[PDB]
Enzyme design. Sequence first.
Site, PDB file in Angstrom:
ATOM      1  N   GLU A 197       0.611  -1.242  -0.057  1.00 50.96           N
ATOM      2  CA  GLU A 197       0.058   0.000   0.019  1.00 50.96           C
ATOM      3  C   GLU A 197       0.765   1.054  -0.089  1.00 50.96           C
ATOM      4  O   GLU A 197       0.587   2.236  -0.735  1.00 50.96           O
ATOM      5  CB  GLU A 197      -1.030  -0.073   1.297  1.00 50.96           C
ATOM      6  N   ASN A 225      -7.678   9.494  -5.248  1.00 49.91           N
ATOM      7  CA  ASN A 225      -8.649   8.518  -6.019  1.00 49.91           C
ATOM      8  C   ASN A 225      -9.467   9.234  -7.290  1.00 49.91           C
ATOM      9  O   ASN A 225      -9.600  10.527  -7.169  1.00 49.91           O
ATOM     10  CB  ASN A 225      -9.402   7.607  -5.221  1.00 49.91           C
ATOM     11  N   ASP A 227     -12.609   9.285  -7.696  1.00 51.07           N
ATOM     12  CA  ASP A 227     -13.711  10.056  -7.096  1.00 51.07           C
ATOM     13  C   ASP A 227     -13.484  11.342  -6.363  1.00 51.07           C
ATOM     14  O   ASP A 227     -14.553  11.779  -5.710  1.00 51.07           O
ATOM     15  CB  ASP A 227     -14.683   9.007  -6.433  1.00 51.07           C
ATOM     16  N   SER A 234     -11.762  11.282  -3.365  1.00 53.24           N
ATOM     17  CA  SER A 234     -11.084  11.099  -2.046  1.00 53.24           C
ATOM     18  C   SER A 234      -9.611  10.876  -2.274  1.00 53.24           C
ATOM     19  O   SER A 234      -9.009  10.666  -3.198  1.00 53.24           O
ATOM     20  CB  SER A 234     -11.733   9.715  -1.653  1.00 53.24           C
ATOM     21  N   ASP A 263      -6.363   8.563  -0.191  1.00 53.62           N
ATOM     22  CA  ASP A 263      -5.701   7.536   0.676  1.00 53.62           C
ATOM     23  C   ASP A 263      -4.380   7.963   1.335  1.00 53.62           C
ATOM     24  O   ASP A 263      -3.696   8.631   0.839  1.00 53.62           O
ATOM     25  CB  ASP A 263      -5.347   6.151  -0.287  1.00 53.62           C
ATOM     26  N   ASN A 318      -8.934   5.517   3.270  1.00 59.73           N
ATOM     27  CA  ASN A 318      -9.607   6.364   2.471  1.00 59.73           C
ATOM     28  C   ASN A 318     -10.395   7.588   3.257  1.00 59.73           C
ATOM     29  O   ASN A 318     -11.262   7.351   4.045  1.00 59.73           O
ATOM     30  CB  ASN A 318     -10.412   5.544   1.407  1.00 59.73           C
TER      31      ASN A 318
END
Length: 129
Positions: A35, A46, A48, A50, A52, A59
Amino acid sequence: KVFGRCELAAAMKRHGLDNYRGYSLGNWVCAAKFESNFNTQATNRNTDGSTDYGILQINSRWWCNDGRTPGSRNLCNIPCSALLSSDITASVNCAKKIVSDGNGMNAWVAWRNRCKGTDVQAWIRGCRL
Ligand SMILES: [Cl-]
Ligand SMILES: [Cl-]
Ligand code: NA
């Protein structure tokens, strides 16, 4: 902070992740490797809108507040920046809520794709724990 492999394993063990909801320590170390490359400061946006955050790439759409993800929930009740600390306590506490929500570690795409069904114990081999 960029952790060493065994340093992170020892830290996650101390914070209660070993066998948490049935997931052995190697699963958590493997997920953190893929990750974030063990980097507590990692961020990724991301599609959309958002973002991380942190060593486990938690998220902002569901779990933390970053002030720029409209309609997001903040289920860990923490600002996302707290997930970037060299102290992993906040990331670990939030991850415990995520992994308990019914889908286990499948919430982490890199775990599903790169750790699930592999010999994850290799990630803690040689460590003094
Ligand atoms: Cl393991
Ligand atoms: Cl992946
Ligand atoms: Na949020």
